[PDB]
């Protein structure tokens, strides 16, 4: 059983910059008769199913940009992205089909870019959720970089930690940013008691938190 190995396991570069990535096999993938290496390279963008990039170690498949290039032979193989784009965010897997099939562990390409403060929005409970007895206050902190960001919830000025649920998107393929949703969930009774609800985002781009709030009894 041919073992396959990729390095590095993660990888982060700027749009327009070159990036290479390595793939090793425990045995030679070259067939002496055909002169061909049975090593292929695939790209799996976030949410999507994988896509074939290169086969026979160096032959670029249809529907694949010319900036992708494969090279190597025997047991050492390389994938060059010659000018990385935002769209190229993905895990890249090499795979042998010389005997059975083995995929590498993957090389994650993260895209680095100029910092961005988050666009914060706060949403009171839907009238529909409050009818059912429940009360979720949601905060979207959109289009920020880098990915480290804290969120805090204040209730009538006092911090609240129980009942929060946080969720990060993968990096965006168009602008290289990240996003996060944070949801503070409560009963309707508990929600009905208090009046001011406040979502604070602490991010590298400011030392001052970005604050968004609303008053329940208002418009």
């Amino acid at each position: 059983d041919i073992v396959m190995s990729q390095s590095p396991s993660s990888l982060a570069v700027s749009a327009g910059e070159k990036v290479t990535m390595s793939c090793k096999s425990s045995q030679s993938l070259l067939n002496s008769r055909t002169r061909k290496n049975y090593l292929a390279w695939y790209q799996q963008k976030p949410g999507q199913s994988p896509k074939l990039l290169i086969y026979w170690a160096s032959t670029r498949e249809s529907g694949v940009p010319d900036r992708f290039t494969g090279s190597g032979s025997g047991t050492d193989f390389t994938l060059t992205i010659s000018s990385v784009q935002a769209e190229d965010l993905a895990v890249y897997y090499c795979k042998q089909s010389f005997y059975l099939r083995t995929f590498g562990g993957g090389t994650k390409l993260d895209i680095k870019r100029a910092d961005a403060a988050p666009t914060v929005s706060i949403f009171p409970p839907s009238s529909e959720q409050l009818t059912s007895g429940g009360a979720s206050v949601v905060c979207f902190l959109n289009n920020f970089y880098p990915k480290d960001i804290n969120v805090r919830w204040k209730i009538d000025g006092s911090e609240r930690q129980n009942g929060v649920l946080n969720s990060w998107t993968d990096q965006d393929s168009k602008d290289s940013t990240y996003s996060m949703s944070s949801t503070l969930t409560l009963t309707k009774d508990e929600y009905e008691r208090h009046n001011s609800y406040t979502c604070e985002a602490t991010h590298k781009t400011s030392t001052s938190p970005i604050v968004k709030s609303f008053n329940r009894n208002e418009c």
Binding site: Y55, S97, T102
Partner: protein, 219 residues
């Protein structure tokens, strides 16, 4: 149009079996091998095995021999994978792949993957709640959202105006809390579009065959 069409999502009980179809159209189904590939949540890809539909001869990864069983129906151009006596370890996305054996030896076409969750937890449909913006001073683009709360299992798909609104959408990966998932999505559109026009969010939950549309009204 070489297309590989895989069934929607599966909940299956521990100790039992799932049989999953991969329906092939756009080519001579018997001229190509079908490969099946596993992908656990936030993991690399793993090759399950391959079936030559012309002969029915199968090969596998030896980890899955006796766990996964591969068949093909030449009449209906449909490959199948059965997984028997399943455990939480079998929870994953499963792809089928067209496998150009004897020439490129690579998987040039991938189906869209079948999500398999192993649990005796019940199928629960989501509650979908509109997120209309409050009282605030935050004024050229408006951001709205949908809270999709209290469903099992994954996945749900979320679209805005049935897919018309594609740019400026962020759907956030669900989070499991106490046998129940919650997820959220946001859409960002011009202030000239809403509320003068309609922004509706479409929630499909194929496990419970739910499709809900939640119209985003103001206030």
């Amino acid at each position: 149009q070489v297309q590989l069409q895989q069934s929607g999502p599966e909940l299956v009980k521990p100790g039992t079996s799932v049989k999953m179809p991969c329906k092939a159209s756009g080519y001579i189904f018997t001229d190509y091998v079908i490969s099946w590939v596993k992908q656990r949540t936030g993991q690399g890809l793993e090759w399950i095995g391959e079936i030559f539909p012309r002969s029915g001869s199968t090969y596998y990864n030896e980890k899955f021999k006796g766990k996964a069983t591969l068949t093909a129906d030449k009449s209906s151009n449909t490959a199948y994978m059965q997984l028997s006596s399943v455990t939480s370890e079998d929870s994953a996305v499963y792809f089928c792949a067209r496998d150009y054996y004897g020439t490129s030896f690579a998987m040039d076409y991938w189906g869209q993957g079948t999500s398999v969750t192993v649990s005796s937890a019940k199928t629960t449909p989501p509650s979908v709640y509109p997120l209309a913006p409050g009282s605030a001073a935050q004024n050229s683009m408006v951001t709205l959202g949908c809270l999709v709360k209290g469903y099992f299992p994954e996945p749900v798909t979320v679209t805005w105006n049935s897919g018309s609104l594609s740019s400026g959408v962020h759907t956030f990966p669900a989070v499991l809390q106490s046998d129940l998932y919650t997820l959220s999505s946001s859409v960002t559109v011009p202030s000239s579009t809403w509320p003068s026009e309609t922004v509706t969010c479409n929630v499909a939950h194929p496990a419970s065959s739910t499709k809900v549309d939640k119209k985003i009204v103001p206030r």
